[PDB]
Design a protein around this ligand. Structure first.
Ligand SMILES: O=P(O)(O)CP(=O)(O)O[C@@H]1[C@H](OP(=O)(O)O)[C@H](OP(=O)(O)O)[C@@H](OP(=O)(O)O)[C@H](OP(=O)(O)O)[C@H]1OP(=O)(O)O
Ligand SMILES: [Mg+2]
Ligand SMILES: [Mg+2]
Length: 160
């Protein structure tokens, strides 16, 4: 139902989520897409009308989707799903035809404080820690470069 919030400018869906890291920052928590059941992504979901801020949405989604609790330690800013629902070539480069973003993502970095075995989606998703290299490859395999950009902005140790 239309409890969902949209950018008054672009019409993009507003979504918040978490890059969840281990205290030592060597791993990131990933979950399986419910739709695309073999794609590994990060916890996120739609902002609802009642929610006062993006952090609220981000921590709600991180609990509901991954059973993960912790503390927001950084604002990672915004990224856009630029997937289209066909090309235009500018002489030394080529691009997809102009369209509004599907989704504007507000990401936060979270330091994991607990992972619980029971959570709302624990029967609908898998959840696993990954090092930077494996996480990067997951997000390429999932076709989600915008979630990789959010990961890259995080304090995750990349020197593997
Ligand atoms: O229910 P919420 O969490 O509040 C809201 P969502 O944003 O979490 O639910 C997502 C939504 O599906 P739908 O609206 O039908 O529920 C997306 O469709 P789109 O953004 O194009 O409108 C879909 O992205 P796409 O890959 O199909 O393009 C995404 O799959 P993905 O996991 O990100 O790959 C779904 O996430 P899942 O929670 O199912 O994993
Ligand atoms: Mg949701
Ligand atoms: Mg979601």
């Amino acid at each position: 139902r239309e409890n969902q919030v949209y950018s008054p400018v672009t019409g993009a869906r507003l979504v918040a989520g978490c890059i969840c890291l281990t205290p030592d920052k060597k791993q990131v928590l990933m979950i399986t897409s419910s739709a695309h059941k073999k794609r590994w992504i990060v916890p996120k979901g739609g902002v609802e009308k009642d929610e006062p801020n993006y952090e609220t949405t981000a921590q709600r989604e991180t609990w509901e989707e991954a059973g993960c609790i912790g503390k927001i330690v950084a604002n990672l800013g915004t990224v856009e799903d630029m997937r289209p629902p066909q090309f235009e070539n500018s002489r030394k480069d080529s691009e997809v035809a102009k369209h509004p973003p599907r989704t504007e993502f507000h990401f936060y970095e979270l330091e994991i404080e607990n992972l619980l075995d029971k959570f709302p989606e624990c029967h609908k998703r898998h959840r696993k820690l990954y090092s930077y290299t494996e996480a990067k490859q997951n997000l390429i395999d999932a076709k989600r470069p915008e979630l990789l950009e959010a990961l890259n902005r995080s304090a995750i140790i990349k020197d593997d």
